[PDB]
Amino acid sequence: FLGLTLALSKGRILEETMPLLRAAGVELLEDPEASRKLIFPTSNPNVRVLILRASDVPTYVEHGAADFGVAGKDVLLEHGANHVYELLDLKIAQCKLMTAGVKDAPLPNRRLRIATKYVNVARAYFASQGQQVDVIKLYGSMELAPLVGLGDLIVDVVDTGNTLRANGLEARDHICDVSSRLIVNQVSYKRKFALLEPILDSFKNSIN
Amino acid sequence: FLGLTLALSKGRILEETMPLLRAAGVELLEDPEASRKLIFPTSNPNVRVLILRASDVPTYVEHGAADFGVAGKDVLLEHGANHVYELLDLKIAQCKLMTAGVKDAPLPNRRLRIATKYVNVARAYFASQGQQVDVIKLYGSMELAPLVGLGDLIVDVVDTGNTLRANGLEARDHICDVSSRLIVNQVSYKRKFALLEPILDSFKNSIN
Amino acid sequence: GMLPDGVADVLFEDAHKQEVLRHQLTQQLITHGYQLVSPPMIEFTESLLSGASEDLKRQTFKIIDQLTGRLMGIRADITPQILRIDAHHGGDGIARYCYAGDVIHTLPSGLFGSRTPLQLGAEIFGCESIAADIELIDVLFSMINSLDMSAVLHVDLGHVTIFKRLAELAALSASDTEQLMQLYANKNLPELKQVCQVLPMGSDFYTLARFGHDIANLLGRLSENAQQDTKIVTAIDELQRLKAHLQVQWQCAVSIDVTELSGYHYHTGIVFNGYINSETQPLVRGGRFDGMPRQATGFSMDVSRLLAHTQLDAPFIVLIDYDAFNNLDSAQRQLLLQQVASLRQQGYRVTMPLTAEDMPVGLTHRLSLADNQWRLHAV
Amino acid sequence: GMLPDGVADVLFEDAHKQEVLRHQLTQQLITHGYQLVSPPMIEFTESLLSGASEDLKRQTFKIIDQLTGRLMGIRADITPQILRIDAHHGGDGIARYCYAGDVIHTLPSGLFGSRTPLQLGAEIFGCESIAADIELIDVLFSMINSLDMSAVLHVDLGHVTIFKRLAELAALSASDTEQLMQLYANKNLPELKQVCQVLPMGSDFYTLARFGHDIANLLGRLSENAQQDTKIVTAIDELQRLKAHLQVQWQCAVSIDVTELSGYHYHTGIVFNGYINSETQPLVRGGRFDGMPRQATGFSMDVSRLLAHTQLDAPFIVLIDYDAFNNLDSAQRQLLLQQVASLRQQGYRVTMPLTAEDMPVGLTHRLSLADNQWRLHAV
Amino acid sequence: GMLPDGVADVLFEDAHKQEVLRHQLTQQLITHGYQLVSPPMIEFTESLLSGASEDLKRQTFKIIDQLTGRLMGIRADITPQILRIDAHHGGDGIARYCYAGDVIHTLPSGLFGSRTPLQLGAEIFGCESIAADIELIDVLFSMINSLDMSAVLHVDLGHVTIFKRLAELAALSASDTEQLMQLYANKNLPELKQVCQVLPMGSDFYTLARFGHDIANLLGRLSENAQQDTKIVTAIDELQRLKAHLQVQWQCAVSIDVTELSGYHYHTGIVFNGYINSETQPLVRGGRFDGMPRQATGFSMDVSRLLAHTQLDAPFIVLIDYDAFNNLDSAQRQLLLQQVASLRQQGYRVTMPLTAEDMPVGLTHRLSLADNQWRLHAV
Amino acid sequence: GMLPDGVADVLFEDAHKQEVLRHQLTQQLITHGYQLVSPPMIEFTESLLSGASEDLKRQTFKIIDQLTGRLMGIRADITPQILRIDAHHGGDGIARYCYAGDVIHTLPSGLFGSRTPLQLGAEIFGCESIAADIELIDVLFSMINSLDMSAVLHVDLGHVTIFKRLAELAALSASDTEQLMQLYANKNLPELKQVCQVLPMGSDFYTLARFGHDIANLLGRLSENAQQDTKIVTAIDELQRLKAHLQVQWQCAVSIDVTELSGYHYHTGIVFNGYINSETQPLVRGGRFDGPRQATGFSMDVSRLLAHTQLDAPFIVLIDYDAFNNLDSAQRQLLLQQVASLRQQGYRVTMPLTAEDMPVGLTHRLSLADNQWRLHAV
Ligand SMILES: O=P(O)(O)OC[C@H]1O[C@H](OP(=O)(O)OP(=O)(O)O)[C@H](O)[C@@H]1O
Ligand SMILES: O=P(O)(O)OC[C@H]1O[C@H](OP(=O)(O)OP(=O)(O)O)[C@H](O)[C@@H]1O
Ligand SMILES: [Cl-]
Ligand SMILES: [Cl-]
Ligand SMILES: [Cl-]
Ligand SMILES: [Cl-]
Ligand SMILES: [Cl-]
Ligand SMILES: [Cl-]
Ligand SMILES: [Cl-]
Ligand SMILES: [Cl-]
Ligand SMILES: [Cl-]
Numbered sequence A, B: 001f002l003g004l005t006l007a008l009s010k011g012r013i014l015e016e017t018m019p020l021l022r023a024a025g026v027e028l029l030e031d032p033e034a035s036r037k038l039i040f041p042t043s044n045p046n047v048r049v050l051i052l053r054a055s056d057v058p059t060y061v062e063h064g065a066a067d068f069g070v071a072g073k074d075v076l077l078e079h080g081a082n083h084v085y086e087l088l089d090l091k092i093a094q095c096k097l098m099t100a101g102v103k104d105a106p107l108p109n110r111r112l113r114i115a116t117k118y119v120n121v122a123r124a125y126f127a128s129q130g131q132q133v134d135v136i137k138l139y140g141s142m143e144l145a146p147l148v149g150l151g152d153l154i155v156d157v158v159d160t161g162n163t164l165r166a167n168g169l170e171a172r173d174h175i176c177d178v179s180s181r182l183i184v185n186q187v188s189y190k191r192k193f194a195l196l197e198p199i200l201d202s203f204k205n206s207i208n
Numbered sequence C, D, E: 001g002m003l004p005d006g007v008a009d010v011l012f013e014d015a016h017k018q019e020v021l022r023h024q025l026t027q028q029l030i031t032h033g034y035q036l037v038s039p040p041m042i043e044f045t046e047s048l049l050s051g052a053s054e055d056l057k058r059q060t061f062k063i064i065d066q067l068t069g070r071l072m073g074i075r076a077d078i079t080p081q082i083l084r085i086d087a088h089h090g091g092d093g094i095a096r097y098c099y100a101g102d103v104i105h106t107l108p109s110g111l112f113g114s115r116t117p118l119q120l121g122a123e124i125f126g127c128e129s130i131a132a133d134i135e136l137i138d139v140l141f142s143m144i145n146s147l148d149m150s151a152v153l154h155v156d157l158g159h160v161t162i163f164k165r166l167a168e169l170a171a172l173s174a175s176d177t178e179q180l181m182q183l184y185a186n187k188n189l190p191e192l193k194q195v196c197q198v199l200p201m202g203s204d205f206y207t208l209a210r211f212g213h214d215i216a217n218l219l220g221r222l223s224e225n226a227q228q229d230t231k232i233v234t235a236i237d238e239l240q241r242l243k244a245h246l247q248v249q250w251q252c253a254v255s256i257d258v259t260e261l262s263g264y265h266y267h268t269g270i271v272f273n274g275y276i277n278s279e280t281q282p283l284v285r286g287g288r289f290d291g292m293p294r295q296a297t298g299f300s301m302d303v304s305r306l307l308a309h310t311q312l313d314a315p316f317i318v319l320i321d322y323d324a325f326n327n328l329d330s331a332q333r334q335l336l337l338q339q340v341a342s343l344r345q346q347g348y349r350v351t352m353p354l355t356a357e358d359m360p361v362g363l364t365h366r367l368s369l370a371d372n373q374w375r376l377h378a379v
Numbered sequence F: 001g002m003l004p005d006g007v008a009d010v011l012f013e014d015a016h017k018q019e020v021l022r023h024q025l026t027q028q029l030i031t032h033g034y035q036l037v038s039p040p041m042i043e044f045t046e047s048l049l050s051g052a053s054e055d056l057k058r059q060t061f062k063i064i065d066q067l068t069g070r071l072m073g074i075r076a077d078i079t080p081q082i083l084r085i086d087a088h089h090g091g092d093g094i095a096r097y098c099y100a101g102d103v104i105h106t107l108p109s110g111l112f113g114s115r116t117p118l119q120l121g122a123e124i125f126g127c128e129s130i131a132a133d134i135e136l137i138d139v140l141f142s143m144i145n146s147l148d149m150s151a152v153l154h155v156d157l158g159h160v161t162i163f164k165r166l167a168e169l170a171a172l173s174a175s176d177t178e179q180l181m182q183l184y185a186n187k188n189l190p191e192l193k194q195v196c197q198v199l200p201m202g203s204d205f206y207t208l209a210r211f212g213h214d215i216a217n218l219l220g221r222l223s224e225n226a227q228q229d230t231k232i233v234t235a236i237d238e239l240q241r242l243k244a245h246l247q248v249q250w251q252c253a254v255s256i257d258v259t260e261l262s263g264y265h266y267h268t269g270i271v272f273n274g275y276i277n278s279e280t281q282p283l284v285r286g287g288r289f290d291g292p293r294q295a296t297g298f299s300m301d302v303s304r305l306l307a308h309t310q311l312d313a314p315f316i317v318l319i320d321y322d323a324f325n326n327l328d329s330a331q332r333q334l335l336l337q338q339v340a341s342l343r344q345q346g347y348r349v350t351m352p353l354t355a356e357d358m359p360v361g362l363t364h365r366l367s368l369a370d371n372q373w374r375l376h377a378v
């Protein structure tokens, strides 16, 4: 395939990216949620789409299996964004990386245990605060971890705070601001700029 | 909580473990599918159940946040079952860890790229075959990886083979047999053996 | 600064508590007739790692003695130093020793473990009898009860002799032995059942992992050859006596795991692991070991791990009023200093202020001059 | 076994004495308002050797953290760890800290000096005033008097500011500054005299060495410019207040040496060195140094060097009679063990025998049954 | 056995090819007047990481010297060793060095990249002129052309002085400088445009990213303050001369990127990055650096990365027929061995067999006997 | 700047010579059928120190792989890596390997030894016959002779099988065996006499140290039990054969020491030590070792040949700065063509950056006289 391969995260990022893609002349020809297909054609025959789990988007782009992709800043910070160009902040899927604990519970005098997907971000954050922490990698939902004593705190993305409050947790510290970014493979940026540039301009103009 | 905490995986593990629990006198008080709850009480007031992503079950169990759990042997091999006891082959969700590649595509002569969830299993397996490999971690679905050239092979669990064949892939090498195992925290096994024994006996009786 | 992993400051009230604990437990051991020794942090590796397992050598940092060009180690374990001391001072009779000092480990022992424990321990040399082990148990439990914790110690008992004997009778290879120990550490009964079907006396090796917890019936489940082996019969009986003693004398919940084989190379008999609440790493480790032919048994614990489970009385933190102290003439100052010395002798923490802003952390009381008299008032 | 040079066992009664001293001196510091901290033995060199002298760097053993591959060290000095702790926890105000912990040195200081001292100390951060230095003296001599030694503590006072200020006012090169320090350290008056003839303010550098011991007249002996210099005037005044306080309040013999310039780069003012009898290396070293601009002043000492100058009362070492004990019924046993518990609470060291031959080292008394009553008899 | 990531065996014909490449490239550099030096794999960190960037420090494995206790490192870069050699042997004039040796990195740079490169390079010390950078280019392209590759080398020129000078003239804070560098690295023009609208001379910083590629018109796009800076003017002129020389003399495809600011701390001027085909990590890295005020410029490359792009003539792999050889009389064997020595001198790989089965790998010819004469026959 | 003890730069003409030596010796081994391999400097200790003796372990610097947390080692010996390579690539037949690379030691072995030798070697796997050992010797000596040194190689032969068999037959404990090795290590005959009197077959163990040098009569001096042992008879015979081969084929002065037992745990038979002049550390170490797969080989530190070898004086040419700058563009390209030819012949030609740019060791100037460039000696 000689065109561009676009890697997209499923769910909220997919939903908020569809308009930008529409404006750039790239619509999917079917609903990914109702499909067995893994590679999707688009209205532009020079572009195809992969629908991936969020944490796999940087992996496909950096190895050149996709030429470019859309991923949350949370995923890129945790993954390490070293081998891709973060060309554009798309200002979609805005949220916050935060620490969170059980509602009203005090910090225990012993060393803090953190349970989280965002293991590198957790260590990096608590390093800058001068706190020493034990960190436990989780792959799934984190809201349960404080409630059954796995960790004292979690690190997760928070938008409204409703998921935290519904599980008897509260947001504690703000780590950083998150939004979805366009990442580009370093080779693809040179070899396929002609194909890329119109699409990058259309995304840039949509964000205005 | 003074009783036992049981960590279960969603899906095939949960559905096939419910009967074993029922025979042991433990029934969930409501349906997990139609519930927002994370912690579930049972008909036995000394047992409560956690519903986790499969890869987190060994984590919760080894740290004692769960006293015991049901987990695929694939997940335990990948994670490392060094800090937990593997007491029983429950013989549910029987399948195989295998390599898989594109249908009829022969191996390239160059260094092989393996894309997989099962990074540690893959390294160990290809090391034992005297094969130098480049391993790429994936969190999501692995069937896409050979089709966009991310890797030459994948390592994944195979039962019928229908998911592979539906995506233009074929099973290649058998790595090992996999089934769900009953795991127990070491401290829990020592301290709460009186609570554990009847349930473990029930499970054993149900399986043999 | 940021400290290495498994390395923590103990600060302020926690440090004060650690000092109190260290001192109380040491004095208790002394008053039970254990001779306090305080060997140094470093020695030549010749002495410090004499007869050491591969585990202890990997755990010991090495450093260079510039005066001789020789290797030294920072101790990972005080027990090898007690061997050295006992060899020169101990004689052929019974000798008792205790100690409390820092040890350093290259890697943590387990999940988020400390690399800088405050190791406190007691050892009895020169007594073959199970009575020495029972004295250590009694001294340990007495020490534990003096701390008035709400945390509960669960005791797990093992006995390396049982497995070592079966290994010799079965004539197991080094690789078979290493495989079984690996499978025992994870109590991997499915794979152990497979491996044991193709091994000599494999029926017994499986039985140890499957039924080792049930110590009253373990002997009958073993093969005819293993039942005739006196050391196996003795080891099982030793386990039964300690179990009974712990339940009767101390109301202690005891579990048995005869496949507990960590420290295979240093342990020579009964082993003891005390777990605090549900914490993964044992608080107390002990058991029988080899002197240099000389019997030995002992335990040790990280004093630092007691800090989350113990409580001191709230301290009395007192500040003398700055203005009123400066208004005093020389003879009134000397009387106040006499009064302050007396309060300090009772355990009040009294600060003499350097300025009007000088404020001790955690202030509870002021010492204030009212009608030519100094009195304490709460803040 | 051979131990390395500067590395010794502290055993038995010496170990008991060291335990008592560490604890009592620590409790005294806490009662004077100093917060106990217990930093770890090992840190990353980044923090441990931040702003260190070349000597401290060379004195610090290096080791590799196997979890990061970064450099760590074994502390040779606790003070830099107190800086780290104070930077994070201290705030802007006054803060007091004390500590007692093992440090390790690559090379000994004195002839046959220790490389493994038990370093005990106290520090005050955030007070510019000489009052802080006087408080430290009060604390130090309160501790020394509690030791009830026959040995005499002689105190040398210096003040590095005097020489530093003269060197700045004299526009001394690094070369001349080094030469003067060498000559001061070696007490070579004749060469000092010659070298001073060709230096600006040379007579002042000579005056420090020749007449600095007479601190009451030193200011009037200096040149017009040095007499008027504010830091020199203050420094000399500080020496006089500190001398007067030591002799008057604490009955301590004080000598002045304003040419005491070791630790030139760490000391920022007054320096204190306490000597025990005629021993060459000071027991106590102290003075002003930098925090962080944060004021700091402190002292430290090797607790193990107090062992040879302190005494405890002879211990009571008791052995329960074996035969009589085993002959008791459970209620009698219970009565005896309460009586033994009371003895142990009073510091008696009571061994329960494991055999008829179980004999504690240094036995002083037998607790024997005679006429249905248990009593102590001297051996 | 499994090898670590970024660690590979180089085997057989690849090894032979690596040997030929290392030798021929070293000999070429020697013939251009570069002095070969072979510094060791390990050194004290004092020398090895003198004035090292933070990156180089992290990339260097640490080990302890057991003769001194001092810290050593396994070299991650040969250039600091060349500085050391030049400081002692180089004098004040021009000095030329080349080298070829193994270096180890703690982490790989590229995806599945090597941690064990065979680093080859050349450096010129003591020349300020652009002429020295031009000579290095001439030597590099002479070497590249000798390899007879079909792969095309694309050269990227930058010059760190331009941005550094703009940063000074704009009085940028560290955090502002770091933010611009991250945006340049990431090619984020839209966010760069926004950050540059709120910065002093932000229009020049945005110009570097948007119009740096066009070097002929770059000076004339910059502000008046930047156009008046001689260092910026010189830097741009240096870029133009190098570009012209690479197109004229070598017909090289040259891109300019003045936002190429990796190695911001070691580079001091003009930089070159040679890329092979479409591989992401540059094959050749070069540029101006400091001779810690000694001028230095150089380049290096991993020789092992040439292996995939170069070919040798197929090897002649000869087996002497075992049975026919052992039927020979002594005189016939001597004549055959003379023929074998002659073949070996011309680069034939002749195996003298130990057995009838002795079979070299990749056999191409047999030296067989046919009608009383020894000839090569293809298999 | 100062370097660690036993760590030396190799500089300038010595570096050039080291590179020539490395290349020539490697190419010689390749032309004798040895497969070149270049294993890495670092590996996991799991592979690198698989079945390693305590001395090899102590000599190996350990480091941590940040990617996995596992211990790696910097190689102190390339032979274990050849074993790994042979196990995967070499099959059941005969296989030949050669190598040349840097190895690193934690401590120097012996008086003022190097810790960073350039280790060059060759190994034959899969041949039990003494013929493989003979082939290695012939290769070795062919390499040594090609260097045209005036320095002389003395060979010392040993055979660990003789002592290993006597120790098994006598049923010695570990501590007795170790005591005999220490006494053998510095041939302490008086104390060996005492220790041997209390040991089983003690006169055999004393005979090795005392009469081991006289290999023709050694069998006749051993006890009747040792004389009946087939492996002892073969070992003594192997020593006689190699001694005769070295004398007849190579005119080599050979000494025998059957108590040469350093590397007791890796050597499985014949051992070979080559000494250059009177130097304390052998230049060449070799011997039989384990692969059940037979192996035998040698290695040497290439850097130790530098003091004993010489290359021809180099031709170091400087082009005249002023004449070069006065040339037009077409004339420049003709000179460069002429210079490219000089370089192809092995001349070292400096194109000057300045009029003061002078190469070290200048022998010739290239000078412009009557529209022609010619070489003149300085
Ligand atoms: O602050 P809130 O508005 O409650 O949103 C926060 C949620 O978003 C994230 O999950 P994600 O969006 O990946 O999954 P979800 O859509 O199922 O919550 C996160 O793990 C929380 O569950
Ligand atoms: O050989 P088959 O019978 O097709 O089954 C194999 C599939 O099972 C697993 O799916 P997963 O655990 O994600 O469950 P799912 O198939 O229900 O998604 C795995 O990821 C394979 O795709
Ligand atoms: Cl909240
Ligand atoms: Cl591309
Ligand atoms: Cl990975
Ligand atoms: Cl299939
Ligand atoms: Cl529990
Ligand atoms: Cl401990
Ligand atoms: Cl001290
Ligand atoms: Cl490189
Ligand atoms: Cl060597």
Ligand SMILES: [Mg+2]
Binding pocket: C077, C078, C079, C121, C299, C300
């Ligand atoms: Mg111990």
Ligand SMILES: [Mg+2]
Binding pocket: D077, D078, D079, D080, D300
């Ligand atoms: Mg200090």
Ligand SMILES: [Mg+2]
Binding pocket: E077, E078, E079, E080, E300
């Ligand atoms: Mg370099």
Ligand SMILES: [Mg+2]
Binding pocket: F077, F078, F079, F080, F121, F298, F299
């Ligand atoms: Mg070797």
